[PDB]
Amino acid sequence: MVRIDVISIFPAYLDPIRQGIVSVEVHDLRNWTHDVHRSVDDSPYGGGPGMVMKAPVWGEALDEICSEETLLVVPTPAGRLFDQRTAQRWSTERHLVFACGRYEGIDQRVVDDAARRMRVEEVSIGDYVLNGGEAATLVMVEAVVRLLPSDGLLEGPSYTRPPSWRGLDVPPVLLSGDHAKVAAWRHEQALQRTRERRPDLLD
Question: Would you count residue 180 as binding a second copy (CB under 8 A)?
Answer: no
By CB under 8 A, is residue 22 in contact with a second copy?
A: no
201 is in an annotated binding site: no
Which residue in the set 3, 28, 77, 93 belongs to the binding site for a second copy (CB under 8 A)?
77
Q: Which of 81, 148, 184, 202 binds a second copy (CB under 8 A)?
A: 81
d(CA 8, CA 98): 9
- The helix (run of H) or strand (run of E) holding residue 123 is strand 119-124
80 binds a second copy (CB under 8 A): yes
Of the candidates 102, 104, 137, 109, which has an alpha carbon nearest to the alpha carbon of residue 123?
Answer: 137
Binding span for a second copy by CB under 8 A among 21-29, 41-49, 65-73, 91-99: 41-49
Beta bridge partners of 169: 164
- Of residues 69, 195, 197, 202, which one binds a second copy by CB under 8 A? 197
For residue 168, the cross-strand partners are: 165
Could you give the maximum distance between any two Cα atoms of the chain, in Å? 71
The reply to whether 22 sits in an annotated binding site is: no
Q: What value, to the nearest 5°, has the Cα angle with vertex 42 and ends 40 and 47?
A: 150
Touching a second copy, residues 122-161 (CB under 8 A): 122, 125-131, 134-136, 138-140, 142-143, 146, 154-161
**Cα separation, 195 vs 203, whole angstroms:** 10
Tell which positions 85-124 bind a second copy, by CB under 8 A.
Answer: 86-87, 104-109, 112-113, 122
69 binds a second copy (CB under 8 A): no
CA distance 147 to 37: 41
Helix (H, G, I), strand (E, B) or coil at 1: coil
CA dihedral 14, 32, 130, 111 (to 10 degrees): -120
175 labelled ligand-binding:
no
Among residues 20, 36, 37, 84, the one that binds a second copy under rule CB under 8 A: 84
Of these, 165, 187, 192, 195, which contacts a second copy (CB under 8 A)?
165
At its nearest, how many Å lie between a second copy and the CB of residue 47? 7
Detail the residues annotated as belonging to a binding site. 101, 125-130
